[PDB]
Design a protein that fits this description.
Four copies of one chain form a homotetramer.
Chain A (H helix, E strand, L loop, with lengths): L1 H13 L4 H4 L6 H42 L12 E2 L2 H16 L1 H4 L5 E2 L4 E14 L4 E15 L22 E11 L12 E11 L7 E12 L4 E3 L2 E3 L5 H41 L6 H6 L2 H26 L6 H19 L5 H39 L9 H12 L5 H5 L6 H43 L7 H4 L1
Antiparallel strand pairs in A: 1-7, 2-5, 3-4, 3-5, 5-6, 6-7, 8-9
Helix pairs in contact in A: 3-6, 3-9, 6-8, 8-9, 10-11, 10-13
The structure holds cholesterol hemisuccinate (3 copies) and sodium ion (NA) (3 copies).
Chain lengths: 485, 485, 485, 485
């Protein structure tokens, strides 16, 4: 009698939502609003990423240009950080950067101009440095001394050194050439949503840190977006317009509703759970069951909770940046990215309503724990090889310098990548270390490819075999499916 | 009695054609004409592709030469599109292209000459552009203004600027140097089927679009094939001859006959099908069978229908191009390519007449659906990682700029390609995004290699196991094989 | 009674040779002489290959040097065949080669000298060539005309052109600069077995074939080994000595003996075979057995026959070259290589005397046929993709030019190699062909990795399962093992 | 009665240590001290490797700088060994190195100075060399003659040759420019544990060995660490301090204790073993058992013995180098590396106390022997291809020069790496060898990927199947587990 009521409640909880409408006619609003969330957050990421793509492309093209203009002897990809080994070359390159700053209106191409105005030279060298290696002696004050100078851009008189730059090269940490420029992007006039002007704050670093007769040279531009006061097109006045704000607000609306409903379904599942527990204990003195208790919990909803939280936070920060017109898009990108990932996994929630898809996702879920355990063991062997190869082959190989590069290399070697370059880039300056490199790599690659990938394949193959055998000959006993039957 | 007649008809429909001649002596003409089609379309593709290969090789060698002649500072592979960052270099390179156009008879090597005659300079810049970034202001007319000029090739007077080219560089979209040249290929005199002369229409694009202080520079030659009026060899007059036309016509003949016969066999299969249905229902009141209805349909014939249609269309377009002597071979190549692919699959029709080959092809066919479903699921996870990596690691990685490049990268990572370059080409300018790159790549590569390829292997392994078990212990019940037995 | 005699003979034929000495004490001479052959042919290949390695290293270092001396603007690896696009550069490079030939005693380093004497210029251009592309007309005599000239090396007067070289560039096929030089290798004085002096016959080819405004440039040296008349060391007279000849003769001895004994064992196996047949038929009227007839044949001996023949032939040619002192080592290398390969497989004959090794080699042999059949089918699909990708993506991809390069690429893609470079090196000049490239590559790589490698793994896994089941539960019935039991 | 005592002893020996405290309350000190050893040796390797990393980085940056200063025309990565092909270039480069040595205080950047003083030129050429290749004759004295010279660094008079260097280039083996410099590292003042000053002993080798008109050029610096007499910071006197010594001593303490206890447990296991043997024989006349005898031996302890020995030796050598302040870290690195590897495997000892981990490690151990046997067979086939490809494709391929490079290549090809570059880097100068290259590579790659990796997967899959079946249906009979039960 009442047992029948419990069977009705439970089966109503275990039936698919599409099955909860063919039988009892409950309108599936939850599926609809989730689908809305999926397409919504997707479109959000797409538009936001296209905008970022245009802005970043503008920035990258610009900084490449500034490198080819201000840095002498720059080559595409010299790690984007070439070095100089001679005093006269340091002087020639500083002079090159300055003279190319003062002729920027005559030599360059783009829409570049000045802050409207100074070019900041900045020496950074030790307060007291007296180094005598020929006598095996030195006296240092690690506290830092600074010097500076400003060239007004309207001074074409000086352009046989002219400016008063003089160096020591015994006490020196870095020279910095700091200045600022302004430009405009013209692909963005077609889209009012983007600010048009852009501020560039450039610094050229001549780094003599890590004294080795090798001065690193780098350029870095830290930028600032700005909204123009006004801008015309064919006589028509125009200012920047915002409509993405309302879109993001509607994202927060949708994800908030989904959050509320999902929490309601979780709490309902827990109340129904304890109801089952207390009812089952009371009626027949039997209730030491834990797996069924988990079966009432549904991790997918939890995935949607984490997803909704991350979408809301990322959207608030997004609105903040589009309002203040900042250019630092790093946290929102990650929150929204992870969110989307979890959302599409939600669609994999919306493929398990088929028994064959159900077979496959259940195979994956059932396999995951044993795979993680075995990844612990193989991770232990992996760590062993990582320390060993790091300490032994660090000095004699381009890789293996840092433990991270080690892990990257060994991982790639498990997955076939870049073997002959590893065998070949080794130095034969020491023969014993070279032999050990060989035993290390043959033993490693053989052990992890020929024995262990094989065992992963054995695991997933075995789980597929079992759950196939369950969809043939029935699941194992649970005492809940018995009660439903 | 009549059931025996049905067994005779059906078994006559289920027996192999080689088996339909050892028993009843029906001459297999269909196999013969299909084989003729196979070798025919193959030889077609080979000859057509060799011709295209010669023409394309001539074009490519030529355009490489024109790049090294007219473009200053060209390097093999600077993406075939090098850039310039300075006004004086733009002037020097325009001047280089012009002076190398006017000295082309004295400096070059090949058989180059002129249209018999103008060198077209063409500026393309805004009608009204007034850009003041120093004041955060600009006024634009996005409508385009054009200017032009023509240098007669017989003007060696001008060769300290001489021509009247002057630029603004604030309003500018592109400069175009358009001209035309004529040449002859001499490997083709040995083959009358090919036209000998070739027209080249060259354009040099100095692109200042996407204003970033970086002017793209490209060369493009759009060509036109031409038949010479006449051409001699050792005193013997010769003009171009065509025999490939008859060949293509015979292709259309063969494929048309195959099309007709195959459609006849499909329609016969459908009439025999409904005959079986109505007969089986009428006799014993049993006919709710759908799998047997499909078993009367044979998809291979359909493959041959699509194949024949594509061969006929591609051959008509082929004859059209060889008649009009055009140089645009893109649609015919694809129709004929896909056609051939389907034809060789037809030969795989002509390997299933052996029970072991039959075991293997049946294994593949039986496995394909479940593989496509699982490719749907894993495609969902794949899309998640694609969006996430796109938005997060777009700005800080050379890959990941566009979703397509993302999908290409992740696909390559599933199949082992180019890992250490992905781990290594990342920028450490932001540490949090870098960590996230690591979790992203380790988690991704591990998840798709160590768990999912394994599951594909489990699927095909399982299907091989089953159908092996069927060729041992017999197929499952169908109620058609029962009637035949 | 007599059946027992047959059991004794047969079991004596089926027992291992080490088992034929523990029981009946037959001295295994065959194993000993085969082992002798293994180590013998191995040592042969090693010494012969080390010698070749020294000679080839000398040649390669030399030709690299001659490239850097005589070819202007040579770069390491410009495909070893750089091109020139300008007349004046052709003149400058010819002049460079000549002047660097006449100053070779003053500019160079090594032990270079002359034939003791001419530098051969050789033009090769059409007899009659009159090409007018501006009028779409041309008259040709494809017969070839030649001109020549000789610069005596002792003419420093000429060194503003001096020599009388003049070109047309409309009729021209190739210019050839042919000459000869002599040198000595000094690593070989330490080894009397090698001739010390070396002759180099150099030709520089300026190839204007395939008229495209691009003249290929290559250097080729065809060499000739020579034995010096005499050579001293510290006052001691020395001439080249040969002892490798006797070694090779002893190789021919060993391999000949093995050949004889193996043929004797094959013929004995055939006589014993027909004896079994006739005896089995005569006694019980039962003899329609073919598998047992094969079981008396042993393919390993055949492998040793082919091996011995190839070792003898390669050794005769080897002795011929060491006698005549030629430098063409291409056929002997291949005969000896294949021979050695088959010999080490012979050692795999000498590992099947263990039941576990026996399990594995039997697994491999039992799997091979079905693998070859399935490689036929998958080869058909492979050919389809090869033709399609060849014709479609030939013009728009650096690969896919020739069917061989296609097969190499697709093979590499099956085995994971070089994906992102294939996706990325495609040209977006045509969007439809680009899309088709994508469907082509995703479909291909997915089909051959995710479904077919899986099936190979299923095959070998299945065979291992079966033969495991036979070493557990006994082999199947043969009616020969029944008679032995 | 007494059998019960034996069951108690044995089960006390077979129970886990954590199980030997939940039941009988034996304090597990061994686990604690081993864990201490794990973290200890780990931290040791980390600190030691970071120090080495700083020192090696300093050295590498330095030698790169010296290359760019003293070697003319040096390029990043010209194999770090560029060559010269002309006399005048040899003179120009020697002159460059000398003049850049004498201006080192004016041209360079770092903290470089002199020994306080000579620049050593050293010719090495034959005593008697008279080579006449034009007459096919030569007379040699392979004994070596040497010449030398010293330029005082304080001689700016000479800087139109000035120094008296003259060469022959017919008799010559090598020129050596040897000198010494002193420098200081400043990242190390922050760490008193490291000596600050560094000695560099530089040699430039112009190698004319292997006479081929190609002089190799290399730079090599052999260094010597030195402790400065004193060094100040902001007026505070400072000398180098050592605390790592005590740490290493405590390593030796821990590993020694572990060594002692482990040997005690092994010997106890052997005494208990023979006790079981003699007792089992005496009581029931049954004792021909060998597997149980091994089951009393535990290889993990042995792994810890080898580990402890290697840690102690490496630590003694470590203390020796930190005391004497040497810079040769090659043996200690390897001993400590292998040690750590074995230690983390020890942690895999500390994961087998779980039955699922136990399933996996037992799967791996049970699979290893058959994998090694099959690696013997496949190694035989591998050797065959190695010899064949070595001798045939040595001269015509960049790889395949040496047998080691062969093995590296073929190994990479088994694991997918670098196929299209192997197919493509072959020379078509000989067509037969090229075809053979194709059959070689297709046959090889197909045979080892499509058939043999498959069989490894079959092996590990089979072992997983079996031991799964044992943890389901119980282990096989041993007659020891019977006695315990
Ligand atoms: C191969 C499959 C079966 C499992 C592989 C496991 C890896 C994905 C994980 C497991 C633990 C990780 C390691 C845990 C800790 C570190 C220390 C970490 O230290 C550093 O930051 C290096 C520089 C420094 O020492 O400061 C470097 C990465 C590394 C080796 C990690 C690299 C990646 C590892 C090996
Ligand atoms: C990994 C195996 C198990 C299945 C992987 C599936 C892929 C072969 C397919 C399935 C769906 C495809 C995606 C469907 C839609 C798009 C959007 C498409 O959008 C663009 O054109 C990018 C530029 C733009 O946004 O305009 C980019 C390719 C992409 C990600 C496709 C890439 C290739 C995908 C992921
Ligand atoms: C992928 C596995 C399952 C089987 C793959 C089979 C390949 C190892 C073989 C089978 C047949 C071979 C093909 C047979 C014939 C030719 C024609 C041959 O024609 C040429 O010589 C190209 C130049 C010309 O047309 O003259 C090019 C190689 C090719 C495609 C071969 C390439 C290598 C193939 C595809
Ligand atoms: Na790979
Ligand atoms: Na792989
Ligand atoms: Na790879």
């Amino acid at each position: 009698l009442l047992e029948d009521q419990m069977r009705r409640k439970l089966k109503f909880f275990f039936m698919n939502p599409c099955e909860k409408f063919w039988a009892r006619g409950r309108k599936p609003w939850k599926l609809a609003i989730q689908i809305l969330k999926i397409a919504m957050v997707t479109i959000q990421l797409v538009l936001f990423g296209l905008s970022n793509q245009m802005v970043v492309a503008f920035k990258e093209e610009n900084t490449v240009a500034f490198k080819h203009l201000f840095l002498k002897g720059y080559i595409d990809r010299m790690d984007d950080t070439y070095a100089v080994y001679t005093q006269s070359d340091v002087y020639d390159q500083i002079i090159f950067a300055v003279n190319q700053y003062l002729q920027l209106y005559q030599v360059s191409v783009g829409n570049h101009a000045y802050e409207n105005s100074a070019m900041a030279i900045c020496q950074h060298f030790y307060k007291r440095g007296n180094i005598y290696p020929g006598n095996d002696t030195f006296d240092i004050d690690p506290e830092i001394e600074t010097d500076c100078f400003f060239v007004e851009p309207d001074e074409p008189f000086h352009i046989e050194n002219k400016l008063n730059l003089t160096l020591d090269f015994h006490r020196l940490l870095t020279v910095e050439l700091q200045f600022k420029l302004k430009a405009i992007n013209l692909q963005t006039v077609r889209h009012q949503e983007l600010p048009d002007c852009y501020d560039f704050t450039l610094t050229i670093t001549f780094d003599n840190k890590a004294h080795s007769g090798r001065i690193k040279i780098s350029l870095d531009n830290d930028i600032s977006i700005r909204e123009c006061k006004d801008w015309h097109v064919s006589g028509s006045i125009q200012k920047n317009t915002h409509n993405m704000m309302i879109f993001d607000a509607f994202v927060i609306l949708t994800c908030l509703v989904s959050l509320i409903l999902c929490i309601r379904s979780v709490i309902s599942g827990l109340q129904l759970q304890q109801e089952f527990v207390n009812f089952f204990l009371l009626h027949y003195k039997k209730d030491v069951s834990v797996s069924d208790q988990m079966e009432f919990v549904n991790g997918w909803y939890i995935m949607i909770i984490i997803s909704d939280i991350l979408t809301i936070i990322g959207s608030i920060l997004k609105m903040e940046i589009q309002a203040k017109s900042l250019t630092s898009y790093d946290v929102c990108s990650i929150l929204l990215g992870t969110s989307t990932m979890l959302v599409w996994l939600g669609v994999i929630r919306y493929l398990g309503f088929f028994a064959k898809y159900n077979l496959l996702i259940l195979t994956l879920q059932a396999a995951l724990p044993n795979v993680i355990r075995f990844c612990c063991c193989a991770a232990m062997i992996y760590l062993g090889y990582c320390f060993c190869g790091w300490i032994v082959l660090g000095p004699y190989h381009n890789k293996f310098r840092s433990l991270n590069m080690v892990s990257e290399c060994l991982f790639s070697l498990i997955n076939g990548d870049d073997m002959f370059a590893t065998f070949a880039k080794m130095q034969q300056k020491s023969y014993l270390v070279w032999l050990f490199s060989r035993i290390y790599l043959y033993s490693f690659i053989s052990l992890f490819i020929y024995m262990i990938l094989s065992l992963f394949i054995a695991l997933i193959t075995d789980t597929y075999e079992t759950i196939k055998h369950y969809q043939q000959d029935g699941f194992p006993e649970t005492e809940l499916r018995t009660f439903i039957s």
